[PDB]
Amino acid sequence: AQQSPYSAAMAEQRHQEWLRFVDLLKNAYQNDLHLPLLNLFLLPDEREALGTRVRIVEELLRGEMSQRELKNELGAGIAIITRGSNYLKAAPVELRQWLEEVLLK
Amino acid sequence: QQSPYSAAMAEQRHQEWLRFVDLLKNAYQNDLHLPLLNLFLLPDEREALGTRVRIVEELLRGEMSQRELKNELGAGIAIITRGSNYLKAAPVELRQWLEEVLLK
Numbered sequence: 001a002q003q004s005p006y007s008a009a010m011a012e013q014r015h016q017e018w019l020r021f022v023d024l025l026k027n028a029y030q031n032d033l034h035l036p037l038l039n040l041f042l043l044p045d046e047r048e049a050l051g052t053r054v055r056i057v058e059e060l061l062r063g064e065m066s067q068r069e070l071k072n073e074l075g076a077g078i079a080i081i082t083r084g085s086n087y088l089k090a091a092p093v094e095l096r097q098w099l100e101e102v103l104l105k
Numbered sequence: 106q107q108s109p110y111s112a113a114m115a116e117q118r119h120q121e122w123l124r125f126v127d128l129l130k131n132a133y134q135n136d137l138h139l140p141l142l143n144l145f146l147l148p149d150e151r152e153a154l155g156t157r158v159r160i161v162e163e164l165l166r167g168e169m170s171q172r173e174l175k176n177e178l179g180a181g182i183a184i185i186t187r188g189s190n191y192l193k194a195a196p197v198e199l200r201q202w203l204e205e206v207l208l209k
């Protein structure tokens with residue numbers, strides 16, 4: 001096994017719990033309950049962070065905004081730009097290509 | 106007190122949030138939601154969402170005690186108070202649906 005039984009048992013529980021949330025939200029979208037579901041489960045600052053992270057990813061893909069514009073307009077300093085860029089690189093290419101189609105056109 | 110400056114900022118934040126919500130909606134339609142959520146949420150944030158579902162479930166079920174909520178879910182009294190408030194503030198259609206699906 002990759003992990004010792006204690007760590008593996010914790011990870012399996014967290015994994016099932018994550019998928020339960022993912023499925024709940026999937027069905028909420030189908031029922032047009034997604035907005036109140038997300039308001040329940042995400043704090044206001046967490047919702048704002050998600051909105052801002054979308055802009056950071058958009059601007060990283062677009063390539064036009066400078067480092068200082070990213071910091072002054074979106075709060076993204078050097079470390080945030082580096083982390084977000086790393087997360088983008090780690091994503092499947094299929095997702096990156098879809099994000100380019102949605103977010104940039 | 107809301108000013109035109111603060112209102113303009115709040116409306117932009119609102120639109121930015123709705124843009125994320127729409128992006129994720131379409132990702133679910135195209136089976137890209139799992140990698141999208143891994144990109145946009147940090148591991149501890151994803152864990153927090155999974156645990157908050159259990160907190161809401163157990164608050165609705167009404168069986169676990171406060172000590173059991175703290176021990177099993179890490180949810181101490183302040184978290185339970187906040188979560189209970191968020192549940193009570195939810196619209197009736199959501200609370201009714203959560204009762205149906207989480208206590209299935």
Ligand SMILES: N#CCc1c[nH]c2ccccc12
Nearest residue numbers: 053056083084144145146147
């Ligand atoms: N660091 C950090 C938070 C974070 C998660 N996903 C991101 C995507 C872009 C920028 C920042 C983030």
Ligand SMILES: N#CCc1c[nH]c2ccccc12
Nearest residue numbers: 040041042043157160187188
């Ligand atoms: N406090 C806090 C985080 C939080 C947001 N939504 C919740 C629902 C239930 C418990 C906790 C939370």
